[PDB]
Amino acid sequence: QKFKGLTVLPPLLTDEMIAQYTSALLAGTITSGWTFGAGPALQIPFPMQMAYRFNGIGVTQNVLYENQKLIANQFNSAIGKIQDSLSSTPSALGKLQDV
Amino acid sequence: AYRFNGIGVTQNVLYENQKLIANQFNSAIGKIQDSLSSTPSALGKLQDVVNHNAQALNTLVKQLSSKFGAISSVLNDIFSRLDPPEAEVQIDRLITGRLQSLQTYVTQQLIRAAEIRASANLAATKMSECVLGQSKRVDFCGKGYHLMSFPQSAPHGVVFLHVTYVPAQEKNFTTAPAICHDGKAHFPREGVFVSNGTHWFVTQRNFYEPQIITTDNTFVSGNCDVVIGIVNNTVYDPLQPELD
Amino acid sequence: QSLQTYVTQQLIRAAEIRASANLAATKMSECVLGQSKRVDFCGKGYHLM
Amino acid sequence: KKFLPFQQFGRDIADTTDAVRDPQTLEILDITPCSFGGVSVITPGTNTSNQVAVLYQGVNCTEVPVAIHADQLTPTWRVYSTGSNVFQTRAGCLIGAEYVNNSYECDIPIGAGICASYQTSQSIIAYTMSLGAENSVAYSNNSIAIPTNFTISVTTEILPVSMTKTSVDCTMYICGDSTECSNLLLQYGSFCTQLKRALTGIAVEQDKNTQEVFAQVKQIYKTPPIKYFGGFNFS
Amino acid sequence: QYGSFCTQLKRALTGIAVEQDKNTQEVFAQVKQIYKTPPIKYFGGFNFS
Ligand SMILES: *[C@@H]1O[C@H](CO)[C@@H](O[C@@H]2O[C@H](CO)[C@@H](O)[C@H](O)[C@H]2NC(C)=O)[C@H](O)[C@H]1NC(C)=O
Numbered sequence: 137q138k139f140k141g142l143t144v145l146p147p148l149l150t151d152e153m154i155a156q157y158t159s160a161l162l163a164g165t166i167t168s169g170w171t172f173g174a175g176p177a178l179q180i181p182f183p184m185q186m187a188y189r190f191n192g193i194g195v196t197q198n199v200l201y202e203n204q205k206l207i208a209n210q211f212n213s214a215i216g217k218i219q220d221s222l223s224s225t226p227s228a229l230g231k232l233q234d235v
Numbered sequence: 236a237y238r239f240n241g242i243g244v245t246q247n248v249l250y251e252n253q254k255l256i257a258n259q260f261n262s263a264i265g266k267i268q269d270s271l272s273s274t275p276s277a278l279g280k281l282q283d284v285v286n287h288n289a290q291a292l293n294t295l296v297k298q299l300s301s302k303f304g305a306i307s308s309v310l311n312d313i314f315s316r317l318d319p320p321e322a323e324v325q326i327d328r329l330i331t332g333r334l335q336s337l338q339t340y341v342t343q344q345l346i347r348a349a350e351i352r353a354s355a356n357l358a359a360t361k362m363s364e365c366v367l368g369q370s371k372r373v374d375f376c377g378k379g380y381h382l383m384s385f386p387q388s389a390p391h392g393v394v395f396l397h398v399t400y401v402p403a404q405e406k407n408f409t410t411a412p413a414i415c416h417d418g419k420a421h422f423p424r425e426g427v428f429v430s431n432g433t434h435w436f437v438t439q440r441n442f443y444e445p446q447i448i449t450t451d452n453t454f455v456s457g458n459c460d461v462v463i464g465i466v467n468n469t470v471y472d473p474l475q476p477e478l479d
Numbered sequence: 480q481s482l483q484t485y486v487t488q489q490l491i492r493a494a495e496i497r498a499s500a501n502l503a504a505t506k507m508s509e510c511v512l513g514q515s516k517r518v519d520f521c522g523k524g525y526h527l528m
Numbered sequence: 529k530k531f532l533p534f535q536q537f538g539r540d541i542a543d544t545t546d547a548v549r550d551p552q553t554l555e556i557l558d559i560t561p562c563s564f565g566g567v568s569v570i571t572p573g574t575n576t577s578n579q580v581a582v583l584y585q586g587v588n589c590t591e592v593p594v595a596i597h598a599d600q601l602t603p604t605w606r607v608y609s610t611g612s613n614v615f616q617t618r619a620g621c622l623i624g625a626e627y628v629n630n631s632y633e634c635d636i637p638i639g640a641g642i643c644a645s646y647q648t649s650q651s652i653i654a655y656t657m658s659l660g661a662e663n664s665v666a667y668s669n670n671s672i673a674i675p676t677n678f679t680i681s682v683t684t685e686i687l688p689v690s691m692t693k694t695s696v697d698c699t700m701y702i703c704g705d706s707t708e709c710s711n712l713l714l715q716y717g718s719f720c721t722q723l724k725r726a727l728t729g730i731a732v733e734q735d736k737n738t739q740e741v742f743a744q745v746k747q748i749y750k751t752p753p754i755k756y757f758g759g760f761n762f763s
Numbered sequence: 764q765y766g767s768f769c770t771q772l773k774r775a776l777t778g779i780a781v782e783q784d785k786n787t788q789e790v791f792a793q794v795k796q797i798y799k800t801p802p803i804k805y806f807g808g809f810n811f812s
Pocket residue numbers: 431432433434
């Protein structure tokens with residue numbers, strides 16, 4: 137394809153720069169919450185912001201604080217199943233393969 | 236005051252600061268007209284529509300001087316100096332070349348019309364949700380917590396002025412998830428417990444306003460053995476001075 | 480005509496990718512940078528983060 | 529490449545001549561046609577300076593200096609303009625710009641993380657672009673930050689709504705004044721009614737776009753003659 | 764004689780190639796400051812490793 141007049145141009149942002157952007161978004165949403173997207177980043181501990189996100193869906197915050205270890209275990213096992221399920225079944229990324 | 240209650244700030248914060256908020260809004264509007272005047276590269280989105288339509292029309296009228304392999308681009312020069320039975324292949328190849336030129340004008344007009352339709356549907360959604368109401372969606376009607384918006388017409392388009400709230404000057408405090416008073420855990424009803432360093436308060440989450448922790452201000456759930464970061468303080472219970 | 484019919488499908492596919500990228504920018508603003516109330520926009524169930 | 533001794537030609541995926549044997553030495557030799565770049569020109573705008581930088585898009589520029597050749601564009605610029613200020617990127621290589629180790633905002637995007645700008649005995653510099661200010665949020669197990677003040681911000685957002693309505697006449701565009709051309713256009717059928725239908729649908733759609741954006745109210749409301757809204761100025 | 768037919772193809776492909784970098788920059792570059800995680804990773808039992 138190169139030798140018939142056709143060029144593939146490289147993207148402006150490399151993959152390390154996109155990975156640094158997603159690392160900045162992850163560190164902002166863990167250490168600050170929703171506050172970094174609406175102004176300066178204000179820190180809060182993670183179970184206190186998870187209590188805030190339970191109040192967002194209509195559940196009182198003592199449901200979090202009296203069940204904190206169980207909710208943490210369910211979240212960790214869910215992340216592990218995400219990695220094991222995404223490692224198998226090789227048609228989950230068909231949208232990016234079709235491009 | 237209703238739009239401050241929409242973003243989680245109590246409505247006294249407006250009325251005690253009304254002159255300051257009015258001055259900040261008026262200085263903000265004046266900086267909109269000065270900054271949008273004194274830059275050249277704003278309103279490029281509306282300028283590109285006019286440039287693309289004019290450039291497509293100049294391309295279509297400049298392709299009437301292309302021969303398409305014929306001996307001339309003038310029809311009477313085909314009809315002069317050449318007999319009419321074998322002039323047909325030249326004039327028919329001219330009709331085809333002008334006709335696929337017109338077809339490839341129309342196809343990119345259809346593609347650009349679909350792009351303008353997606354933009355106009357977004358502008359109708361923004362006029363319904365930002366101007367005619369107050370939006371909870373993050374960064375849909377500007378950066379910050381949305382208060383209101385104002386429309387202004389522009390040639391071939393619309394300009395929205397989004398008025399938003401930004402928090403400014405922050406302080407560090409020590410915090411705790413609950414208070415164990417009498418063997419009972421107290422949770423804040425609509426705020427957060429902060430410590431100055433010696434005494435604990437409860438405040439609203441988006442503006443610093445400390446309050447005395449009372450029984451009217453908190454709710455009780457369970458006992459103080461299950462919550463991890465619970466601390467000891469007193470909860471005021473405003474009935475004891477009003478007992479006699 | 481082969482080149483022109485390449486460029487036309489590239490324009491149509493670029494419009495499709497642009498609609499997908501605008502949806503991804505909306506999901507990053509509303510599901511990652513905040514908490515969403517819209518049903519089934521950021522997963523099945525009541526959205527946490 | 530093992531070449532199966534009767535065979536004389538070699539092809540790639542796209543059936544282009546790839547490897548030819550020697551006809552008497554009987555050795556297998558590749559064909560790589562030496563050709564093909566693109567010249568890209570970096571300028572700061574001609575009101576500010578007239579000096580440029582030149583990107584060659586896909587090459588090693590150990591092998592730049594040979595040729596541009598079409599009519600009279602020629603090697604005679606090139607024979608000592610290779611020289612210094614040669615920087616190899618992953619987007620080709622760049623001539624006329626000097627690499628620095630600073631990291632700035634992007635001004636003119638070269639590509640692959642490289643941008644270029646014009647500053648500082650002024651010159652063209654090229655740098656690796658910076659993503660933003662470094663920051664660390666002081667996370668702790670029991671520390672929160674509460675704002676004590678605020679700021680009212682007004683920002684603008686520009687959106688296109690409609691474009692220009694255009695309609696066509698076929699016979700005046702294609703033929704014009706000659707009747708025999710219209711008789712030959714008559715044999716080609718109804719392409720022209722299809723193009724007129726397409727442009728008419730676009731022109732109806734533009735007025736529909738403006739009417740969905742702006743006509744969301746049914747009554748024309750009026751401001752009062754007094755303009756006092758508690759100190760807010762809307763003039 | 765077909766001098767003005769390749770210029771529109773080159774303009775269209777250049778507009779697509781600018782538009783892709785614009786798509787990536789609208790999705791990912793929504794923050795202005797590069798925040799860092801703390802050196803100790805304890806978030807109340809949640810494990811983001
Ligand atoms: C933390 O804030 C509290 C706010 O109540 C401060 O307590 C007040 O301190 C002043 C003098 O320091 C007294 O006159 C008030 O009566 C106190 N108020 C209450 C309700 O006790 C406290 O001093 C602050 N701590 C520090 C270290 O500055």
